[PDB]
Amino acid sequence: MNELKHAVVPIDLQSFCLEGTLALWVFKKECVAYDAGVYTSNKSKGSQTLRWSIFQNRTLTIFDVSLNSKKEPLSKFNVKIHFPSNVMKDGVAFSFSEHSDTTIIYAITHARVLYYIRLSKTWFQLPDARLDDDWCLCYRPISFLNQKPDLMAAISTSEICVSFFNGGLTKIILNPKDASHYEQHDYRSPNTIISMIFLSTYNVLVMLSLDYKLKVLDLSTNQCVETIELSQTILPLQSFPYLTSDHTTNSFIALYYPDNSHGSFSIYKLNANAHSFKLNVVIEKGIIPPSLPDDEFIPWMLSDFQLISSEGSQSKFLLIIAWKSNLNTVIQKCNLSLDQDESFSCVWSHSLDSFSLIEKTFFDVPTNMSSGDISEIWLQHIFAHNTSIESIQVALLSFQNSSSQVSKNKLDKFGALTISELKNAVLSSIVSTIQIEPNSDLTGYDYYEYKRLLYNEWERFAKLVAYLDHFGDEILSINFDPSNAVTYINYANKVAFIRDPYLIESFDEEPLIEGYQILDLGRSLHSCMSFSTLSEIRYSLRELVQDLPSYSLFDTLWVFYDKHIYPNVDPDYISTLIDTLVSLENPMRDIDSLIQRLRNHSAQSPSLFLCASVARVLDSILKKFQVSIEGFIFLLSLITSQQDYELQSKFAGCDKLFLSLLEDWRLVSFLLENSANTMEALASVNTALQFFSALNISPLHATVISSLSAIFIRDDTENDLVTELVEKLFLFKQYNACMQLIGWLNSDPIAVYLKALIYLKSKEAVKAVRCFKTTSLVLYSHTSQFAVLREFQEIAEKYHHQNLLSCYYLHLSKKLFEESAYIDALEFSLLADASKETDDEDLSIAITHETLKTACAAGKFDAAHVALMVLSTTPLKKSCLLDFVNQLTKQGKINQLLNYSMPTLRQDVDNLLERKAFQMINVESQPCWYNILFSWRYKHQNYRDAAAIIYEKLSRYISTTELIGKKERTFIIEHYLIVLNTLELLPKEDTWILVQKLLTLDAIVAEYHLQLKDVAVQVTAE
Amino acid sequence: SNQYQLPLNVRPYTTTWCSQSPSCSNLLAIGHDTGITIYCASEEQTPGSTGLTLQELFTIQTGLPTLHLSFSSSCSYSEPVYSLFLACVCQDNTVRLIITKNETIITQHVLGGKSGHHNFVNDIDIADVYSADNRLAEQVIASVGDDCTLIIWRLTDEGPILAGYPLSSPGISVQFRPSNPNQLIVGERNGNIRIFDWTLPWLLTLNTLPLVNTCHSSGIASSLANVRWIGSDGSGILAMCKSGAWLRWNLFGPKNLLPNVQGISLFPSLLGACPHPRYMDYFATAHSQHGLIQLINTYEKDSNSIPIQLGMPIVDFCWHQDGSHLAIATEGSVLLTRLMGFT
Secondary structure, three states: EEEEEEEEOOOHHHHHHHOOEEEEOOHHHHOOOOOOOOOEEEEEOOOOOEEEEEOOOOEEEEEOOOOOOOOOOOOEEEEEEOOOOOOOOOOOEEEEOOOOOOEEEEEOOOOOOOEEEEEHHHHHHHHOOOOOOOOOOOOOOOOOOOOOOEEEOOOOEEEEEEOOOOEEEEEEEOOEEEEEEEEOOOOOEEEEEEEEOEEEOOOOEOOOOOOOOEEEEOOOEEEEEEEEEOOOOOOOOOOOOOOOOEEEOOOEEEOOOOOOHHOOOOOOEEEEEEOOEEEEEOOOOOOOOOOOOOOOOOOOOOEEEEEOOOOOOEEEEEEOOOOOOOOOEEEEEEEOOOOOOOOOOOOEEEEOOOOOOOOOOOOOOOHHHHHHHHHHHHHHHHHHHOOHHHHHHHHHHHHHOOOOOOHHHHHHHHHHHOOHHHHHHHHHHHHHHOOOOOOOOOEEEEEEHHHHHHHHHHHHHHHHHOOOOOOOEEEEEEOOOOOOOEEEEEEEEEEEEEEEEHHHHHHHHHOOOOOHHHHHHHHHHHHOOOOOOOOOEEEEEEOOOOOOHHOOOHHHHHHHHHHHHHOOOHHHHHHHHHHHHHOOOOOOHHHHHHHOOOOOOOOOOOOHHHHHHHHHHHHHHHHHHHHHHHHHHHHHHHOOOOOHHHOOOOOOOOHHHHHHHHHHHHHHHHHHOOOHHHHHHHOOOOOOHHHHHHHHOHHHHHHHEEEEEEEEHHHHHHHHHHHHHHHHHHHHOOOHHHHHHHOOOOHHHHHHOOOOOHHHHOOHHHHHHHHHHHHOOOOOOOOOOOOOOHHHHHHHHHHOOOOOHHHHHHHHHHHHHHOOOHHHHHHHHHHHHHHHOOOHHHHHHHHHHHHHHHHHHHOOHHHHHHHHHHHHOOOOOHHHHHHHHHHHOOOOOOOHHOOOHHOHHHHHHHHHHHHHHHHHHHOOOOOOOHHHHHHHHHHHOOOOOOOHHHHHHHHHHHHHHHOOOHHHHHHHHHHHHHHHHHHHOOOOOOOOOOOOOHHHHHHHHHHHHHHHHHHHHHHHHH | EEEEEOOOOEEEEEEOOOOHHHHHEEEEEEOOOEEEEEEOOOOOOOOOOOOOOEEEEEEEEEOEEEEEEOOOOHHHHHHHEEEEEEEEEOOOOEEEEEEEEEEEEEEEEOOOOOOOOOOEEEEEEEEEOOOOOOOEEEEEEEEEEEOEEEEEEEEEEEEEEEEEEEEOOOOEEEEEEEEEEEEEEEEEEEOEEEEEOOOOOOOOOEOOOOHOOOOOHHHHOEEEEEEEEOOOOOOEEEEEOOOOOEEEEEEEOOOOOOOOOOOOOOOOOOOEEEEEEOOOOEEEEOOOOOOOEEEOOOOOOOOOOOEEEEOOEEEEEEEEEOOOEEEEEEEEEEEEEHHHHOO
């Protein structure tokens, strides 16, 4: 038989890709009964969207998992609809139909009521809490008290029928402020129907009754249009809870009867030929055989089946069937390819759901610091699993109880929500439970007890975890979607997907024709190694990413086997394989080819896309890490002993393809680490996504194909996908993880400048600067680099050319400004000013200016003053010196900065300091008095005129402000004296005040004397 | 405060007192772009405000930048002649031990290339180890880097012994345990904190990441800035995050289940904490970018004490052994400031 495989979706990663979660209204016991999903139901329609509903004890829930291409089929939120009572203890209660751009849902609570809810698609897309309508109307159409329902079946937005245990079928019509109703009205009732089904040509239903009659119904008449008699006596003896007895493709429909213990089942795909007089019925096919793995009294149970045919042409039909026994499940699909044959041509696919405990052994050794400590490793195990969710939460706040109850602690469970902190809470709870007993030697402690304590602690925890998913992981239904044409699947609280085996999987199962045995036997050889072994190997290869290209490439070959002798590796095993190797016909020419044989425009992509693809490709990448590591381990376990005979060149040799393979490993494991509008897709939280969005038959398969293919491709892309990745992604977020990620990524110009910008974003200037230094740019004006070349390119174009170097350094100067760190800018701006080999006017000018800024941001050493002077002497870019020197006196040292205004040329200083003067009277400051005295000094350098004028202006201002008299008067005294002295210093020449001289000064002397008299009066009053 | 200028073309990277050796505790080294400069601190008459002034003694030229700097116990004085031993990190990504008589480098050992760190070196420290007979048996230098490696470099009587150890993440600080050179502490960028016996798995690993009190979320990226021992027997461990979050654990009695105390600095601490040499409960931390320094008391005696605010960025700082003075290197100078309360 053919195999199938599953793709599990963690509800927490859903909650990741779903920002908000709104709820609308209308110990171990409580933990077990905490979650389940009494039933499961997923609908979708012809037009556009998709969502799943999840059931719960006293609760109802629903969220958006659609793979579409719209304006916003991506921004999503999870909806919790709380109910007075549970969604019935049975399979019933569920209907979903739309109308026009809205979702209409019908339900039934536990005892006796119906529910009608209408939710807007927009409401799903929006982050918004609010709704400004009557989203629902509860109603009671028929008396359910009298007749309890057993089957609900939708027909239209307005209307929906119901089936009762008694066997009658009512119909219901609701309308705003309105409801009108119709009928054809262990405990049993020989006209009850087991399971109703609906398909429309316009309005026709199909039924199977307790009488075991096939009743076909016309909605207009509300009477049974047709009846067929199916005669089996041992058939109704078998009664199933829930289960769908019938389903459907398009116009045609199928159903089947197990025939009890035989587990035969069937396919009776009826073709309904609707004639004008009356709709006609023609069933055309007998029975379909089963598979036989379910046995040992293990109860196979038909959970749900869905029939879908190829609308392309009647060549094949496919039926998807889901079985379950207990928590365990089996899934299979039967494909029938017929045209004329009354024969039965059916391919079958098989599936296995099982539990492999990776727990018990990995626990023992945490000795190496490749992945050190203890706890962190286990947490990383729980994250490596990545498929079980609230079970964890339960276990955590069950252990933190210390024999505490639930009813209050339960709310404390609901409360946490936020994931990042969860992990911290995990560890905090763990350390507070395990007492560390001292060694009693001398104030020392016994870590060897902390050893067992911790190991078996997290072991017991994760065992209760597996028990909350040996109680939770459960399947119930399957629902196909036309718009997507995909094999959907419903597990309890864990959505999933069905997929065909990939080559790596088929060859990881360990199940012109040669070479394959080497691969399988080899897989066994890899599986032979220990855990600490693979720890050493991963750390070593992690060391083989950047540093490795530095050594001589092909001598390290034997060295890796010299690293392989440390594990068990019995010489018996060795030689046993060696014997195989020598018997090989011609290994390389076959291997390289057959493995070489193993080897993208997007609309706005949703989120289930990215996360489901994340989990599945994580699976594919881990199994890949397996297969390649295998390949290598072998490659040097062979070419170890008999070195001269290896170099005889009788073998083709393999070093080159070896290198290629290591590139491959670097990428893949880079990804293995990485899992730990489209722009809004990037706007979602989970990691590794950005990649899938970067690389967008079912859509999923092809768009993952695009990714994995883009990984395989080596030299053709001429670029490392890692560098590409971090290049764009750095741009958005995750600035901190791309630290270890850039420390990991292979050294390249691209990689270099990124190392720079990132070590910059971390504000670890130094090393970023060393990165900046040890490289340059010839990559500029390529544009292939995204949204980062463009700056440097704009800058290069700003010089009308492409100057070799100085420009880069310039760009680096501005970038150094963006860091607010000004000193490194002093450095680079220098380098820019100097290395210019172009001799452009414009360029040299721009460079000298940025240098001016960087220097003025530093101030410091005196030269940055004659930089100013260069700029002042060159053209009329004096304004630079203005603001700049302003910033320098904003560092603020006049005794030095004025002496620096000394070597500056007195013309330029006259300009500059007059301007500064004007700015200082303008500023009205309190240390402006100082400013004024300093300008005065400067004037003493010059003609010594203006100073006095400015003194008068100042005086005017002090006065204008306020009048307290008192001290103010004496200040003014002092000012009079000042002016008097400046005048005595300037006897002959004459000065002029806009906005006179000696006379107005006799006047101010008069003011003086006045104030004197005033004072004396004050002293004779006292 | 008294301020002492560094030479005009000297850009400082690191500042450390020679507290490790009592014979030389008034020696201050500044690692810069062309070497390591030595200053002497003396009690002038001054005013007994700052009764301590700095005298620049000399400058050791190396020709390349010095980023980290540690004196060893081997330092000595003679009449006059200073016999120095310095561990430091250079621009070529090498780790070096330089042994001098004053400004003249009489001897130099260099650990680099592939035999050295394979990425940027983030920290270094040094301790002298003596035999049972009590001659100088070994000088031991520990260093950590971005190559996910911790390196123990032992210089012994029969010559050098080199050893490398793998880390789960880049090493950002390392320091031998006070009064017990057999033990040391290593810090990983990711929050892991290793206690290690190099004479020998390594004994113990704490972690600050999952412990953040979260009463106030310390943020998404709270990269570990610093971990240092406190006490003169190395009775304690203090860790500080870039975010300003700090935590203290003691090592004696009974069984232990959480860190003993925890808090948060008013500001981010790019350079990390510098614990007081005399008062365990106290440490200093800088807002290096705006040039403020907060003083923190572990048992909350502190109530936000910010004795130091400059109008300029702080490059580095360290306590003088006396516990009342602080030396601070800024981008163009070194200040000695005396807090009157600690006298």
